[PDB]
């Protein structure tokens, strides 16, 4: 019954907030804003730094293609933005149950699509017609 432990979970008096999709909603769009503002704030920093590297320029140093350097750098903040987005999306929809003592990996994977154990409709069994594998299977999936 090793497989039993994909339903391992110690549940406190109250269900983890995370099981509730709306809480994850909050926290997600919370970080989405938090991210949107970082986005601008970085345009600033990378703006000052543009002009800031012009004044540290010797005449023996090669000129800066602002058009080039500025491109790559915005594009990058854009990427890094999206990156950060999907990443928070990850931590609040996909992987929020990752190693949580208070969420069985079964719960987790299910809840992330807005489902509970009650939505689990069909179980396909190994059920190999052997005496013991069929007791056991039922027993495991049942305890689960």
């Amino acid at each position: 019954q090793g497989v039993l432990t994909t339903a391992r979970e110690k549940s406190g008096n109250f269900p983890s907030p995370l099981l509730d999709i709306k809480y994850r909603r909050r926290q997600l769009e919370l970080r989405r804003q938090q991210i949107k503002q970082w986005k601008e704030s970085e345009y600033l920093y990378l703006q000052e730094e543009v002009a800031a590297i012009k004044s540290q320029r010797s005449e023996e140093d090669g000129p800066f293609d602002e058009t080039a350097y500025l491109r790559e750098r915005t594009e990058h903040i854009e990427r890094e933005a999206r990156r950060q987005e999907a990443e928070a999306q990850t931590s609040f929809g996909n992987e929020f149950w990752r190693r949580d003592s208070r969420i069985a990996p079964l719960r987790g994977a299910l809840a992330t699509w807005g489902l509970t154990i009650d939505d689990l409709g069909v179980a396909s069994f190994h059920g190999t017609s052997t005496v013991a594998n069929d007791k056991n299977e039922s027993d495991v999936i049942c305890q689960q």
Binding site: Q1, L4, T5, E9, S101
Partner: peptide, 29 residues
Amino acid sequence: YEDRIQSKVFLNPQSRVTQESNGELKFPA
């Protein structure tokens, strides 16, 4: 774990082993 405990031990992700009187590592009953 004694067989008695097994299902429980499997299902509770906190359950851990305590050193015992005979030096032995066991789960707690």
